[PDB]
């Protein structure tokens, strides 16, 4: 098919190429450490009041959100700014946690665009909020048989409270025109009140611990990323790899070179990666493409016989899946090695040639010719006594065919626009 002829002559012809494909495509990544302190926010035994809600900054740690997903205690779990299914892989700069204790019926108004006592006077949440709100029942902890009276919230206040603002001052409210100046008279009330938490109260009156998480993105580089997984190592095989974002395809083997402690990979020749430090075991692994090469067919001509031999150039010959012989130019199959040496019939390479036994194909080392030693002496000569005349033929080419090609008739073909 390649020669476009039904009969072929004796020789070697290159037909096609072959490759080895990857099978595993492993991925490595460093160890998952320095988890964010989610425990001291949710499992803390102390919680702040409504008007004096705590604020905590969390940065430069991996945030594992699976513990919140699999928790079987949260009553509400709503995210208002991001897709909550993608929290495990998204990365943000900084996050904040706000914790307080509010009445059960007051958890409804912890949301953008909602109005209420806590929404306007204690905790205001902006309409462009990007985060999640978490709350759960904590009646067994914040309520006592005698009634708890420690938590406070603001109910008298002159002006609405802007988002992410806190008012700790507890000065008396000026409901009346006259200045109260701290007296406990009429139109002068304490701007805070306490919750009457009791174990026998209804569901809407029981205390509820609320944790609010906020996500922000700035021009600073992102620090709070999500956890990432990794696979196992495979060696001595053609395999894709991904080492800390460095992708490629090759065979991973052991290496003897010693990297500097801060160095990661090597670009010794032509800016090509060939050695990569393992992020987990801190070991250096060599990288080499698995295999590629051409395929050649050795035949003695279809006139003589239909037997053929296949040669793969530059192949270790252990990935090719008959006689198999390893040659310096790659192994060949279908040929029988012999101890004998003859003249070169079909060249193969590196001093190896193939021929037909006349009924099998054999491979042998080249013979330069017959070896003889001339009888040399300091008083001996050889003089011919006869002669023969011979005629030899020599052929040299002198010229070729004269051709001429026109542009407009070839490139365009009598087209006006093309011209």
């Amino acid at each position: 098919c390649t020669l476009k002829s039904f009969t072929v002559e004796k020789g070697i012809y290159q037909t096609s190429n072959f490759r080895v494909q990857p099978t595993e495509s492993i991925v490595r990544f460093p160890n998952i450490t320095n988890l964010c302190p989610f425990g001291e926010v949710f499992n803390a035994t102390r919680f702040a009041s409504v008007y004096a809600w705590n604020r905590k900054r969390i940065s430069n740690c991996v945030a594992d959100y699976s513990v919140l997903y699999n928790s079987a205690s949260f009553s509400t779990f709503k995210c208002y700014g991001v897709s909550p299914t993608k929290l495990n892989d998204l990365c943000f700069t900084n996050v904040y946690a706000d914790s307080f204790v509010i009445r059960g019926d007051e958890v409804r108004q912890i949301a953008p665009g909602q109005t209420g006592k806590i929404a306007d006077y204690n905790y205001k949440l902006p309409d462009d909020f990007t985060g999640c709100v978490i709350a759960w029942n904590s009646n067994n902890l914040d309520s006592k048989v005698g009634g708890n009276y420690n938590y406070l919230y603001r109910l008298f206040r002159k002006s609405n409270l802007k988002p992410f603002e806190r008012d700790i001052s507890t000065e008396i409210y000026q409901a009346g025109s006259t200045p109260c100046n701290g007296v406990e008279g009429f139109n002068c009330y304490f701007p805070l009140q306490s919750y009457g938490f009791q174990p026998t109260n209804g569901v809407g009156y029981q205390p509820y611990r609320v944790v609010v998480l906020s996500f922000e993105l700035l021009h600073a580089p992102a620090t709070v990323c999500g956890p990432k997984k990794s696979t196992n190592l495979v060696k001595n095989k053609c395999v894709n790899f991904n080492f800390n974002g460095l992708t490629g395809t090759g065979v991973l083997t052991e290496s003897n070179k010693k990297f500097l402690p801060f160095q990661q990979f090597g670009r010794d020749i032509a800016d090509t990666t060939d050695a990569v430090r393992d992020p987990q075991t801190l070991e250096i692994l060599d990288i080499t493409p698995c295999s590629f090469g051409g395929v050649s067919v050795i035949t003695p001509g279809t006139n003589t016989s239909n037997q053929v031999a296949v040669l793969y150039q530059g192949v270790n010959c252990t990935e090719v899946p008959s006689n198999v012989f390893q040659t310096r130019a790659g192994c060949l199959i279908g040929a029988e090695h012999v101890n004998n040496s003859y003249e070169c019939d079909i060249p193969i390479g590196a001093g190896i040639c193939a021929s037909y036994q006349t009924q099998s194909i054999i491979a042998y080392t080249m013979s330069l010719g017959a070896e003889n030693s001339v009888a040399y002496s300091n008083n001996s000569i050889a003089i011919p006594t006869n002669f023969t005349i011979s005629v030899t033929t020599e052929i040299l080419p002198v010229s070729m065919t004269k051709t001429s090609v026109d542009c407009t008739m070839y490139i365009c073909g009598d087209s006006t626009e093309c011209s």
Partner: single-chain antibody
Amino acid sequence: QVTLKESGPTRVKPTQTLTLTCTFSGFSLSTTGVGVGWIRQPPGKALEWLALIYWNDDKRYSPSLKSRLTITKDTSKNQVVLTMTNMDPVDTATYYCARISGSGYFYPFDIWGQGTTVTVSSFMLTQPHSVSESPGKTVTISCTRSSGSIASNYVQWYQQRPGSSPTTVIYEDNQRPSGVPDRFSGSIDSSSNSASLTISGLKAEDEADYYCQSYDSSSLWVFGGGTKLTVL
């Protein structure tokens, strides 16, 4: 395509205890967050959730029927076994086994099984019963919450054509699963404590029963009363 096979006995007696087995193909229970559940549907009365098994060793049961329910998993040949005792004639219904992949607050039952009929022998959700609408003009169906706020947890919607398992049409209150028509939409009325499913234009055929659900740690999966929709 992932499919589930469920089979078991049909005849049952008040003094006998039955067992159900749902065999799943196309996916493995060992995958992360994957889970298999059992949901029963009475013929004329609304369906309800019974039990669930996750990829790890944890079981969920209906609070009102926790004593009579027990679910066992077997990853050796990809099946789960549900057993129920204390046979009582009102139990007769159609049983489904469905798959859920995630935490529970968010992911609805995406894949449902085939109807298996068992017959005997010898925090609520409110939803309007039925609505009638002429074709062309839009129509909405409400789903209100008795206790708490409807904005506290996500709401998912289903449609169930007769002779077929229910299929998700709205999840996470704004998203649309792939393949559903664009005319389906949803919204939440936070003031009136209700969620509404909106069909923008009756330009196609829709003969199915619509249900709403939500999730809570105290109450687990709970289904609404259902709405019967017909074309005038």
